[PDB]
């Protein structure tokens, strides 16, 4: 999703 | 508890693999840091  | 271990130096390598895509998108960032694509 939006974050690593 | 969190630990830290050295990995590499901050150096530009000359014959680096090129990759990726250039998107042009409209987004909002809300206060909690969440990015959302304008719909």
């Amino acid at each position: 999703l939006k974050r690593r | 508890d969190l630990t830290v271990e050295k990995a590499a130096d901050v150096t530009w390598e000359e014959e680096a693999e090129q990759t990726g895509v250039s998107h042009n998108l409209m987004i909002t960032v809300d206060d909690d840091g969440t990015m959302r694509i304008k719909d």
């Binding site: - | 508890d1 969190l2 901050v10 390598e13 680096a16 090129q18 990015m35």
Partner: protein
């Protein structure tokens, strides 16, 4: 969600400049949760990687001095010291430090994210969990931002902003 900003005061914990794996204890052992950059005595990473938790080297404590949730950035040992700004149309490298992998530079020409404020570079590269905080550098070898806070496209693609503030 909640937001917060912290801005602080330097301590009376020495690290060589460079890129670091941020690891967390077991049992089972240590696991990479992210990446950070040490520059000029200050350790720079992304807020969501540590959430302000104490870092440890050797040794003794390293404690947060500045953080911003909206920016998704945090600095340990002093205020932010990475002052370089990405220019529209210049190519960058990501020094990607993935869990269990050798570091590797990846060159890319970022696109742009348009906000009401202004413009942020957009990096359409997809690294494994644990690699947030990897630095994005310019031709001069200077960090223009950190990787790991972004969006998913309508085609399922992952696209990180260049997370940067303005130093000092």
């Amino acid at each position: 969600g909640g937001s917060g900003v912290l801005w602080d005061v330097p301590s009376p914990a020495e690290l060589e400049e460079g890129v670091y794996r941020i690891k967390q204890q077991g049992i089972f052992g240590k696991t990479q949760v992210g990446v950070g950059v040490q520059k000029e005595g200050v350790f720079h990473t992304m807020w969501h990687v540590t959430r302000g938790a104490v870092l440890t080297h050797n040794g003794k404590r390293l404690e947060p001095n500045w953080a911003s949730v909206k920016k998704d950035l945090i600095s340990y040992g002093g205020g932010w010291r990475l002052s370089a700004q990405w220019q529209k149309g210049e190519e960058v490298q990501v020094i990607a430090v993935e869990p269990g992998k050798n570091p590797k530079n990846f060159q890319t020409m970022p696109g742009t994210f348009q906000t009401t404020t202004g413009e942020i570079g957009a990096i359409a590269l997809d690294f494994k969990p644990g690699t947030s905080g990897s630095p994005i550098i310019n031709r001069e070898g200077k960090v223009v931002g950190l990787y790991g806070n972004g969006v998913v496209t309508k085609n399922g693609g992952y696209v990180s902003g260049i997370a940067q503030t303005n130093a000092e």
